[PDB]
Ligand binder design. Structure first.
Ligand SMILES: C[C@@H]1C[C@@H]([C@H](O)CC2CC(=O)NC(=O)C2)C(=O)[C@@H](C)C1
Ligand SMILES: [K+]
Ligand SMILES: [K+]
Ligand SMILES: [Mg+2]
Ligand SMILES: [Mg+2]
Ligand SMILES: [Mg+2]
Ligand SMILES: [Mg+2]
Ligand SMILES: [Mg+2]
Ligand SMILES: [Mg+2]
Ligand SMILES: [Mg+2]
Ligand SMILES: [Mg+2]
Ligand SMILES: [Mg+2]
Ligand SMILES: [Mg+2]
Ligand SMILES: [Mg+2]
Ligand SMILES: [Mg+2]
Ligand SMILES: [Mg+2]
Ligand SMILES: [Mg+2]
Ligand SMILES: [Mg+2]
Ligand SMILES: [Mg+2]
Ligand SMILES: [Mg+2]
Ligand SMILES: [Mg+2]
Ligand SMILES: [Mg+2]
Ligand SMILES: [Mg+2]
Ligand SMILES: [Mg+2]
Ligand SMILES: [Mg+2]
Ligand SMILES: [Mg+2]
Ligand SMILES: [Mg+2]
Lengths: 148, 51, 167, 53, 185, 122
RNA sequence: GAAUACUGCCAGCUGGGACUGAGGACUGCGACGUAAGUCAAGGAUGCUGGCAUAAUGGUUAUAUGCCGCCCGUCUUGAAACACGGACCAAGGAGUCUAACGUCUAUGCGAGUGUUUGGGUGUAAAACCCAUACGCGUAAUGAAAGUGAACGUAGGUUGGGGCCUCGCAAGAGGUGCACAAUCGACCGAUCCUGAUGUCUUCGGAUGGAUUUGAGUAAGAGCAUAGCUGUUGGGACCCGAAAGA
RNA sequence: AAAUAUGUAAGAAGUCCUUGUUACUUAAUUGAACGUGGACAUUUGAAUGAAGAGCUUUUAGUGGGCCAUUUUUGGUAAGCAGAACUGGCGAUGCGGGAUGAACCGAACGUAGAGUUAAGGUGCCGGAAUACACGCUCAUCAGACACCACAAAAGGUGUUAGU
RNA sequence: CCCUGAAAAUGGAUGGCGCUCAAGCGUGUUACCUAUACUCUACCGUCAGGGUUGAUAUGAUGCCCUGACGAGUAGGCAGGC
RNA sequence: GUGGCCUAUCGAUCCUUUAGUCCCUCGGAAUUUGAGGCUAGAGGUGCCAGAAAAGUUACCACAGGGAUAACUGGCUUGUGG
């Protein structure tokens, strides 16, 4: 709302807060990123190092769907089981009846290992799994069933 | 609410310093000193008058 | 509504006054003002009149009877700051002035209804004035020229400097 | 000075309490009696100007 | 004239009231103003000052943080106080029975605390049962974990995060960031 | 402190106060610094409330702790607010203040004459 | 042997003049009094007079004493022999938008965002909603890739608040946020290379004056506001030119 | 080989006594660095002050300067051009210097009373045609710093002096 | 100290008048004059530190106590018309 | 002993080229050329934090500048007198 802006407060004061000497002009240093290598060099090199030049190799026609792989840690792994059964599965850890988790159905590509799942065996179906995550699952008594 | 100076307003001067009553009752501000007959030495007098 | 309202109003209960530590002590008159002193009136309708100081009233007013038989000033009160006490003194241990006080000079209760478009002296004052003034005259006549001095009116001459005049 | 301060406090813990460790600035001098006997004051006034060239 | 050693008419720089218009928060501020004045307990003063804080200065406190604070010895029976929001945390699988007093509880946090056998409490009931802050434990959330803090102090060799919109190769990973392209920061 | 005075000499007049000067200064213009505020003394209980740990129970005790530079001089002196003096009643006595007192001016050390100057200044 | 000058002190007495009277029950420090009281002791009372209206006072015109250069602007410096302004009315210049930084408010919070769209409606409103999608909850590397607990999620130093003993002084204990520091973990770089074997694959363990915009009991998402940024006619008006 | 200016230290993050860690170090159970435990008391190790102390984010204007004392370069010099420290003006009125950006005094809410600064007190003009000791007589006297200039040289004018 | 050295152009400047045991020059002692400076008091505002609930006390963004402070272009922010 | 006794003796981005790892990629799957990457040097910007650059205008134009010359005034007075 205009009634709350400093434009209202500047009425009656000549320069509108822009100074009498500097005298607000159109584009005193250039337009956009003009002078990034010449007279804006200090700002560019201090606040945006790495701006100029080429690094790496090109990828013609990159489809981001090829690289689709959401990651899930083991601490959030038990959140995929609905809460109506989470407590029941958490108690009475059975080798003959273990919860089956379809992480792909939950929308995850790779299971990672941020750690400390309870010692309750589970079946974890995943496309990709990290080494430590699979060790931690097998330590808890479960197994990883690779799926596609 | 108002600063009342001592050295006037003997009520305030007596509120502070209760000894001021004894000081007035005995005129300690005008005490007479004991007479002493101790003369200066001749070497002091001669040095003072020396050119 | 043309003006909205004030949400809170001041209380109309008047506040009492804090107890005031100012006591009324008697006025300490000047040294020169002693009974029987001839004063000179500096203000009023009787300006420049030599008068005889007779009594100190309780309202800090001097009861003077500048002898009516001599200069025509009655028994009346004056303010001590509007007189000049002169060195000349007259005896007053033949007169009584204890009757004259504030209630004696209580004037009137004028009414607001009363108004004056264009335009007597109380009885008791005349014999009081005569009785007081008799012994004043008897004392005055003991030494010469007081009657003439009281009759004469004081005034300032050319070059008369009151800051070095001895009264 | 740290070692000396520890030594002073160590002695004061047994005898002579209030050893007053802190340094103090140069204090104003106290009273004294300057004897004249054998030291009679004697000095003259300023001296006249001389060319010395 | 006066030789001013300090700047004149300088505001304290501290909040003396919440910046908000929440009337329930202002009632809480009024209650803890009275308590911070008529009680000498420094708990009421700390709670009162925390009641003035902004959102970024009141980070949420997870139930896992509360459980870790309750693992401290002598603190099992204490009353945890969070001047702010208690959020939920699924990383934990056990929760001790305890009393938590907070401004706001998320639905998950309140459910987890109540399911653990405990109770969620407001700061006014906290004031009623612990007027002097008896056996309380004030918890605060991580303030520098904020994403804005990553970019504070940007400069050469400071090791801070640039203010950037697109991330990846071609976005500020070239001259100035590696020796092979000019220099490195 | 003597080097401090030797360094601000062209801007101050200082000297050796007497008991009468100190007593009249503290009685008439003595204000205490209490909780960062300038409080008129006016009472022994205020001085005892702020200097009672140092054994200073009254204004006379404060005056003695000033005239004789006691152990708690620094605390008593800093408790005293800087005296705000008026201009001297009979003037400074000199045509021009900003010469040394020895050179017919006003600044510097005027050791025993500071009493007459301060008395006229308050 | 005195006096006096000079300088200094008195919690010695006293005369004249001037300005001020703030507060508004009481509380306090006191003083004089055997007490009971009184007072000049945390800010003025008492008495009296005149007028009760243009008298005081306000406004206005004038006079008198003293002072006072024309504003705006650029500028080190303007009353300038610098520029714009004869006068008046009306109009007349930091806006909106896309994206965004810091701060603040609000909702919900490991999530968050209904409004592309569907449903419905008292019909451009209000109300209701699925699946997705964006951002976030994982980083690092050019990339192929790999991907976060040795330990009460570490030790040390401080650290608010809390607990215990304490009348207090203090002493212990616990110590969130935050700061400093030594570690651990993940990715990159360099190195070491176990069992095994399509004998060239695999990469277990162990390291480093290396490196990352990382982990180490999540803080974000959304809307709104001031301020700032960029592109836009871009605060308003203004070329010589080009097509 | 000064003066002025300039670095550091004046303790609790300290000191001392034992004995712990290590892959570094020593011939070594030697050190180095970091520690456990113990001891040091209220002057915890000069003075004065401290107006709260630390810390962080974000953003405006500015990026022509000029003056004075002192130091100082070029120049015959300059109200010239160029540096050093400090104080100012710019951005600032007020009293004084008649007048004046900067000099002296002093920095400013609205009033009252008192006292002063710098500067003054014949009259303009508020305030001594004050007091005291001298000097000067100019047919171009002189009369307050910045500052609105004066020199080499000369005089039985007059005064003091060697 | 005074005099000579000492010449510029409209008429003019110890500020002016004037001033000669000065109203000049050197020095000294006093008295006096007056700034928006200093001291005290009131009022306005700002900042700071505090008091106030056995129903406040009236709405505690209120009432109150205490102390200090106040120049300002460019510019920033606040409260208002 | 990690060039010259010390204090000077030199050079970003893009591009090209070489060396190193014999490593990564050419995205339907392979092999071999070819190409592209990662780490480290060189090829050069002397206006040396680094555009690729001839004049004239008295036929001239615009925005400005007393931030800056040419006439007057002011300061100075070498030179002139
Ligand atoms: C003179 C020659 C070329 C020069 C350089 O590539 C010139 C330019 C070319 C260009 O269009 N853009 C740039 O950023 C650089 C370089 O490196 C030298 C060693 C060799
Ligand atoms: K002021
Ligand atoms: K051309
Ligand atoms: Mg205008
Ligand atoms: Mg601005
Ligand atoms: Mg302008
Ligand atoms: Mg360039
Ligand atoms: Mg006087
Ligand atoms: Mg005028
Ligand atoms: Mg102008
Ligand atoms: Mg001119
Ligand atoms: Mg112009
Ligand atoms: Mg015109
Ligand atoms: Mg016009
Ligand atoms: Mg208009
Ligand atoms: Mg407009
Ligand atoms: Mg335009
Ligand atoms: Mg063209
Ligand atoms: Mg400029
Ligand atoms: Mg300017
Ligand atoms: Mg002049
Ligand atoms: Mg000076
Ligand atoms: Mg006069
Ligand atoms: Mg302004
Ligand atoms: Mg290449
Ligand atoms: Mg100029
Ligand atoms: Mg010549």
């Amino acid at each position: 709302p205009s009634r709350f802006t400093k434009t209202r407060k500047h009425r009656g004061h000549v320069s509108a807060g822009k100074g009498r000497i500097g005298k607000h002009r159109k584009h005193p240093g250039g337009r956009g990123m003009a002078g990034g290598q010449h007279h804006h060099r200090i700002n560019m090199d201090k606040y945006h190092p790495g701006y100029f030049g080429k690094v790496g190799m090109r990828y013609f026609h990159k489809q981001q769907a090829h690289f689709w792989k959401p990651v899930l840690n083991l601490d959030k792994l038990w959140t995929l089981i609905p809460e109506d059964k989470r407590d029941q599965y958490l108690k009475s850890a059975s080798k003959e009846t273990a919860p089956v988790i379809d992480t792909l159905a939950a929308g995850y590509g790779k299971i990672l290992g941020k750690g400390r799942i309870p010692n309750v065996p589970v079946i974890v179906k995943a496309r990709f799994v990290s080494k430590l995550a699979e060790e931690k699952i097998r330590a808890a008594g479960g197994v990883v069933e690779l799926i596609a | 609410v108002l600063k009342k100076n001592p050295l006037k307003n003997k009520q305030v001067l007596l509120r502070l310093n209760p000894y001021a009553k004894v000081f007035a009752a005995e005129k300690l501000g005008s005490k007479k000193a004991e007479k002493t007959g101790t003369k200066p030495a001749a070497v002091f007098t001669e040095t003072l008058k020396h050119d | 509504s043309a003006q909205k309202a004030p949400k809170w109003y001041p209380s109309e209960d008047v506040a009492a006054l804090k107890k005031t530590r100012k006591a009324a002590r008697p006025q300490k008159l000047r040294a020169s003002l002693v009974p029987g002193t001839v004063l000179i009136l500096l203000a009023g309708r009787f300006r420049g009149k030599r008068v005889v100081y007779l009594k100190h009233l309780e309202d800090n007013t001097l009861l003077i009877s500048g002898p009516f038989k001599v200069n025509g000033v009655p028994l009346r009160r004056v303010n001590a700051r509007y007189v000049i006490a002169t060195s000349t003194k007259v005896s007053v241990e033949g007169v009584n002035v204890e009757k004259f006080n504030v209630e004696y000079f209580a004037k009137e209760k004028l009414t607001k209804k009363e108004k004056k478009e264009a335009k007597e002296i109380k009885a008791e004052r005349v014999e009081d004035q005569k009785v007081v003034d008799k012994a004043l005259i008897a004392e005055i006549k003991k030494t010469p020229l007081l009657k003439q001095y009281l009759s004469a009116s004081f005034s300032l001459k050319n070059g008369d400097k009151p800051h070095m005049l001895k009264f | 000075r740290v070692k000396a301060n520890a030594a002073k406090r160590a002695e004061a813990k047994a005898q002579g309490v209030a050893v007053q460790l802190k340094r103090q600035p140069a204090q104003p001098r106290e009273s004294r009696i300057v004897s004249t006997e054998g030291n009679v004051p004697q000095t003259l006034a300023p001296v006249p100007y001389e060319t010395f060239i | 004239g006066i030789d001013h050693t300090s700047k004149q008419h300088k505001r304290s720089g501290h909040r003396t009231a919440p910046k908000s218009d929440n009337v329930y928060l202002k009632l809480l501020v009024k209650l803890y103003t009275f308590l911070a004045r008529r009680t000498d307990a420094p708990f009421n003063k700390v709670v009162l000052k925390a009641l003035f804080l902004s959102k970024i200065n009141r980070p949420p406190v997870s139930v896992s943080r509360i459980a870790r604070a309750l693992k401290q010895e002598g603190a099992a029976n204490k009353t945890v106080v969070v001047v702010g929001t208690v959020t939920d945390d699924a990383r934990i699988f056990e929760f001790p029975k305890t009393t938590v007093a907070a401004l706001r509880f998320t639905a998950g946090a309140r459910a987890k605390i109540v399911k653990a056998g405990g109770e969620c409490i407001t700061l006014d009931q906290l004031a009623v049962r612990a007027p002097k802050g008896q056996n309380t434990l004030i918890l605060r959330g991580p303030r520098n974990s904020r994403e804005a803090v990553r970019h504070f102090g940007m400069g050469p060799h400071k090791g801070k995060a640039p203010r950037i919109l697109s991330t990846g190769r071609k976005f500020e990973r070239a001259r100035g960031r590696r020796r092979s392209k000019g220099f490195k920061v | 402190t003597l080097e401090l005075l030797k360094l601000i000499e062209p801007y101050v007049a200082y000297g050796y106060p007497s008991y009468s000067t100190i007593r009249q200064l503290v009685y008439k213009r003595g204000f205490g610094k209490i909780n960062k505020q300038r409080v008129p003394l006016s009472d022994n209980a205020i001085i005892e409330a702020n200097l009672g740990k140092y054994g200073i129970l009254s204004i006379d005790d404060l005056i003695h702790e000033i005239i004789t530079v006691g152990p708690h001089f620094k605390q008593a002196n800093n408790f005293l607010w800087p005296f705000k003096l008026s201009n001297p009643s009979g003037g400074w006595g000199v045509p021009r203040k900003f010469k040394h007192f020895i050179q017919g001016g006003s600044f510097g050390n005027r050791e025993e004459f500071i009493n007459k100057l301060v008395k006229s200044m308050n």
